[PDB]
Structures are given as structure tokens and as C-alpha cells.
Write a protein that binds this ligand. Structure first.
Ligand SMILES: CCCCCCCCCCCCCC(=O)SCCNC(=O)CCNC(=O)[C@H](O)C(C)(C)COP(=O)(O)OP(=O)(O)OC[C@H]1O[C@@H](n2cnc3c(N)ncnc32)[C@H](O)[C@@H]1OP(=O)(O)O
Ligand SMILES: COc1cccc(CC(=N)NC(=O)c2ccccc2OC2CCNCC2)c1
Length: 411
């Protein structure tokens, strides 16, 4: 059923995954010495290319490939339009490996045809808490705890094959070449997400959306006017009333994050993330990179209420091309990122996220039900969407867990 994925070190069925109790590798160990030096074979009219993601014209090439060929919804109404500044941010975190940015281009004219990117991440991915409880009942705590140390692994994103080269088995070649380059750096696990079902997720979370500009969202068919709003004399007026927000944040001491906040944000964030079964571990430099504000890309606010920072939230921006509607060019979406609340209820913290996003002209706020995102869905008028983000590991056996046990935000 899966001519490529049946050859890979991933659990092959939900039934296999349901049987996994402890975290650990799928493969017996390999060595860097075992891995081919030479890039994976490709047709001789193509070549491998490692873009320099600190070079504006190489970023622009990838930007255009993804603008025209990256993820669409199933109804080909919207297509992500990640910006050039977003790609630089996403692809170049501290200690990133340039060789893990993998492209295919035509040899003759250097046209970019396909892309996949890996970045390093330090992830806790040991056996989940409940399975450790049972393991300790049975005298198996040691085996269950064996892989508890945060691991330096690869996070994969931005897999894209030009629309004219689809269904030619080029994505398996991309994946094999990325695997080779990662393996050559002595890393043997990856984490990735997808909206499609592949063998085999360890978690799956529904999408959620919070309308900020419902008139536009209805016009572009992101949203509809539900049937119950039809029993109003003015359905759209009542939809705008449902979703209206303050212009000014409510929390005293809210302000944008600055570099001197990095140590305190790291502390409260890590204290929080550490309570989840799967979660990243961030250095000061990584907190700085992934959370300090960057115009048009990432937006991060702290609560510093006559006291050291006690709370913070972040969101990032991905516009989507409105490919199915001529009246608008872009859908300006905010995505809930990391946050931590120690002094105020989480719903009060995230209400200010929505207030700030609306004031900055975002049309919708999106998230997946990871972290404690379910805890403010109803009060803040998030609605469940039509899809799921599935979380996967490469070469890591892992029990099925709930999405509320996942603390890794993907970009
Ligand atoms: C240790 C280090 C390891 C590093 C690697 C870790 C693994 C990383 C894995 C990648 C994580 C990516 C995370 C993200 O970026 S998810 C975002 C993926 N990108 C898009 O959706 C953008 C638009 N679509 C395209 O560009 C193409 O349709 C793609 C490139 C998706 C497939 O190209 P194409 O449509 O021309 O098909 P093919 O004939 O070449 O290939 C068909 C095979 O590809 C399998 N397929 C289809 N969709 C996906 C998918 N999203 N992840 C993994 N595999 C996928 C499919 O089941 C089939 O295999 P099998 O069913 O026959 O077995
Ligand atoms: C808004 O316009 C578009 C354009 C293309 C596809 C889709 C469907 C979708 N794949 N949504 C998410 O992945 C997603 C949903 C909710 C929260 C976060 C989401 O995605 C993130 C960014 C993509 N990488 C994973 C996180 C929507």
C-alpha cells in the first residue's frame, strides 16, 4: 500500500503503534561510516543544491517554489505563502546545519524543482508518563526510562515538489537524501508533522480557527455563515458581533518581549514544557531566536506587571494566497506559538493574543490542540476545523499519545 514508507523505519500500522510501550529506536544502530558519502542518485539532468539560506537570492528561489507549489487545502482555495523573512527565521536557528537544507534544481538552467529542510532540535521523547507508571509497577522502570535524556534530532519541514513533477516518486528521493545528510552528522531520528495520514502518527490534533475578520473569511470561503445564523435578519451582523474584540489588551504590564527577557522566558517556558511527554528543550540562544519579535514573522508579548516577567505568549504569521477568490490577495493568518502562564489564567493571556492579532490586521488565529490549547477554545470562540495535524517520528518507536501530551510547535 505504501511502496516507499513500507521500506522505512517507521511503525507500519496503527495496530503496530498501539502495541508500543517504551520509546526507542526502530533500527538496530548504524554508524556514520556506514552512510554513503555520495548524494543519492538522481536523473542526470537534475542536480542537488544546498541553498545558502543567509543569501537573499537563494531564499527568494525557495520562496517562489513554495509560493507556487507548497501546501494547499484540499479544495485548492488557499496556498501557504511563507515569506522570505519567515523562511530565514525557520531554517537558520542556532547551530543549524546548512547541509540539511536540500534542493533539487535543473542542471541546465538552475531552475529550482524540489526542496526539503531539516533543522536541529533538542527533544524530550522518552517513554510517556503513563507507560512509565505501568513500567514501574512491573519492575521495568529502567528500560522505560532508558531514552529520557533530551535527544539532538532533526526536525523536517517544507517538503515540496514542483507541480509539474508530481507523482514521479521524487519525494522519496528527497527524503532519502535528507536522511543520508542527517545520518552523516550522527543523527538518527527525526520529527515531522503533516496534514495527511502516513505510517504512523504518534499523535493527532484537530485544527482550530478563531475568526478575527469574519466578513473577509466568509467572502473567501474560509468560513461560511452557519445555518443557525440564517434565523437572524442580518446573519453577517450577528457573526461580526460573535467575533468582535477589544482594540486594547486587558492585562496590565503587557509589552513586547525584549532580549533582557530571555532568561526569565526560558525559565517559565521550560518549567511548563517539561510537564508534557514530548517537548523541546531550548537554550538561551534558541529562546532568543524563536521568540524575540521579528516584523511580519513572529510576535511575542510578556506580562511584566511591576514584577519580573510572569507570563508570555507568542504567535507567528503565515499569509496564504487566496488562489480561489479574486477579491482578496492574501489571508493573513496568526498561529499560536509557545506561551506560559504563571500569574493569570491561560484564557486571559490568550485573549490578549487575539486582541493584539486583530489590532495588527490579522484575519484569523489558528492553532492545533497541543499544549493546553483546548483549555481556552470555547471561551475564546475557537472553532474546530476540517483537518488534523499528525505528528510523526522517523526511526523512533513511540506509543500513541494524546495531542495534549505534545509541547512541540511546528512552523
Ligand atoms: C534521521 C533523519 C530522517 C529525515 C527524514 C524524516 C522523514 C521526513 C518525511 C517527510 C516529512 C515532510 C513534512 C512536510 O513537509 S508536510 C508538507 C508536505 N508538502 C506539501 O504538501 C506541499 C505540496 N505537495 C507536494 O509538494 C507533493 O505532493 C509532495 C512533495 C508532498 C509529495 O510528492 P508527490 O505528490 O509528487 O508524490 P511522489 O510520487 O513524489 O511520492 C509519493 C510518496 O510520498 C509520500 N508522501 C506524500 N505526501 C507526503 C508527506 N507530506 N510527507 C511524507 N511523505 C509523503 C506518499 O505517501 C508516497 O509514498 P508511499 O505511500 O508510496 O509509500
Ligand atoms: C489557511 O490556509 C491554508 C493553506 C494551506 C493549507 C491549509 C490547511 C492546513 N494544512 N492548515 C494547517 O496545517 C495548520 C492548521 C492549524 C494550525 C496550524 C497549521 O499549520 C501549521 C503551519 C503549517 N505547518 C504546521 C503548522 C490551510
Amino acid at each position: 500500500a505504501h511502496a516507499f514508507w513500507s521500506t522505512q523505519p517507521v511503525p507500519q500500522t496503527e495496530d503496530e503503534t498501539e502495541k508500543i510501550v517504551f520509546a526507542g529506536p526502530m533500527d538496530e544502530p548504524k554508524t556514520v561510516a556506514d552512510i554513503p558519502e555520495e548524494p543519492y542518485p538522481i536523473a542526470s539532468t537534475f542536480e542537488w543544491w544546498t541553498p545558502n539560506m543567509e543569501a537573499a537570492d537563494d531564499i527568494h528561489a525557495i520562496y517562489e517554489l513554495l509560493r507556487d507549489n507548497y501546501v494547499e487545502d484540499d479544495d485548492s482555495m488557499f496556498r501557504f505563502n511563507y515569506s522570505e523573512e519567515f523562511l530565514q527565521w525557520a531554517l537558520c536557528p542556532p547551530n543549524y546545519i546548512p547541509d540539511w537544507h536540500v534542493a533539487v534544481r535543473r542542471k541546465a538552467d538552475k531552475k529550482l524543482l524540489a526542496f526539503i529542510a531539516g533543522v536541529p532540535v533538542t527533544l524530550r521523547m522518552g517513554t510517556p508518563k503513563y507507560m512509565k507508571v505501568k513500567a514501574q509497577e512491573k519492575g521495568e522502570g529502567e528500560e522505560a526510562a532508558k531514552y529520557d535524556e533530551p535527544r539532538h534530532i532533526c526536525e523536517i519541514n517544507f517538503l515540496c515538489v514542483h507541480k509539474q513533477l508530481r507523482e514521479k516518486r521524487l519525494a522519496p528521493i528527497l527524503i532519502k537524501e535528507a536522511t543520508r545528510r542527517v545520518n552523516r552528522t550522527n543523527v538518527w531520528q527525526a520529527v515531522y508533522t503533516a496534514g495527511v495520514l502516513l505510517p504512523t502518527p504518534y499523535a493527532s490534533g484537530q485544527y482550530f480557527h478563531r475568526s478575527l475578520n469574519p466578513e473577509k473569511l466568509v467572502e473567501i470561503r474560509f468560513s461560511g455563515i452557519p445555518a443557525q445564523y440564517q434565523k437572524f435578519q442580518n446573519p453577517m451582523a450577528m457573526l461580526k458581533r460573535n467575533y468582535q474584540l477589544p482594540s486594547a489588551p486587558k492585562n496590565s504590564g503587557l509589552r513586547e518581549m525584549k532580549p533582557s527577557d530571555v532568561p526569565q522566558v526560558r525559565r517559565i517556558l521550560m518549567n511548563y514544557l517539561d510537564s508534557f511527554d514530548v517537548g523541546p528543550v531550548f537554550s538561551d540562544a534558541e529562546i532568543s531566536h524563536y521568540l524575540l519579535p521579528r516584523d511580519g514573522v513572529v510576535f511575542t508579548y510578556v506580562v511584566e506587571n511591576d514584577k519580573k516577567v510572569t507570563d508570555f505568549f507568542s504567535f507567528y504569521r503565515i499569509p496564504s494566497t487566496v488562489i480561489g477568490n479574486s477579491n482578496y490577495n492574501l489571508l493573513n493568518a496568526a498561529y499560536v506559538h509557545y506561551y506560559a502562564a504563571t500569574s493569570i489564567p491561560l484564557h486571559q493571556l490568550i485573549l490578549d493574543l487575539l486582541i493584539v492579532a486583530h489590532s495588527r490586521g490579522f484575519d484569523v488565529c489558528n492553532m492545533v490542540e497541543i499544549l493546553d490549547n483546548r483549555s481556552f477554545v470555547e471561551q475564546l470562540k475557537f472553532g474546530a476545523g476540517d483537518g488534523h495535524l499528525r505528528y510523526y517520528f522517523y526511526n523512533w518507536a513511540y506509543p500513541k499519545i494524546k495531542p495534549s501530551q505534545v509541547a512541540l510547535v511546528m512552523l
